[PDB]
Amino acid sequence: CWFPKATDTSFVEKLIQEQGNHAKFQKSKQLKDKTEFCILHYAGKVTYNASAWLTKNMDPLNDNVTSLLNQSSDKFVADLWKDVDRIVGLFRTVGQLYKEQLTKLMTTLRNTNPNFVRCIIPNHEKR
């Protein structure tokens, strides 16, 4: 996600590079045009569309207007944005920003006593 000559596609291709033969990986329906991949979850197989992934994973945006608000007349919007120091105009990745806090959670749970309430869907007809 941090290299010019790279695209969602470029990504996927590399994706096939590493995993490729992963017991839990599988390649799409010859639609690398959309460039998609599959992974064998526990709930079953899924064909993900790697498209636009690098963009989202970066979360960029026009700091010009960003800061523009940072001092806007409207206080609510003021305090809302009051913290714009991380905006992108040119730090940490979404996937790891998340994946980092989700280890915080997975940590306390392992330090508490679990009580499982396994919900079960009866039908997909919403009947």
Binding site: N64, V65, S67, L68, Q71, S73, D74, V77
Partner: protein
């Protein structure tokens, strides 16, 4: 102008003489029109004053009867500003679509373009609408002078 108001107009006009002859210096005309809820531009006032000259503008006087005929002439006009466009112009000084302009840039324009105001004039106006970063929100300032 219904006598009802015309009757009061006098109350306003009269409420404008430091000494007492019952005359409003050619200068005061403007503020008296304003006080009566009028927003005549600087030209709209001179036009109905025969375009005098600074000097004589502090000597010449006015009497309600000769003033009233002007109050109206102005009262009925062709246009007027409005949020719609009014702010549309200030939003051009909004450094970065923030929705706010620096109380210094606003303070400039207002005293360097068209009917140039005074350093104090603008001070008294914006004063108290600048935030921590001295940022004013035109949209509002607009409404302020307006709806006010």
């Amino acid at each position: 102008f219904s006598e009802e108001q015309t009757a009061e107009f006098k109350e306003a006009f009269q409420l404008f003489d430091r000494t007492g002859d019952g005359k409003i210096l050619y200068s005061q005309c403007g503020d008296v029109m304003r006080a009566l809820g009028q927003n005549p531009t600087n030209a709209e006032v001179m036009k109905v004053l025969g375009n005098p000259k600074s000097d004589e503008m502090n000597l010449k006087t006015l009497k309600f009867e000769q003033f009233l005929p002007m109050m109206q002439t102005i009262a009925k006009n062709k246009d007027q500003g409005c949020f719609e466009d009014y702010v549309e112009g200030l939003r051009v000084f909004d450094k970065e679509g923030n929705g706010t302009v620096m109380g210094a840039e606003i303070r400039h324009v207002l005293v360097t373009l068209g009917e140039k105001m005074t350093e104090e004039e603008v001070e008294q106006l914006v004063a108290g609408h600048e935030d921590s970063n001295g940022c004013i929100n035109y949209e509002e300032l607009v409404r302020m002078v307006l709806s006010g």
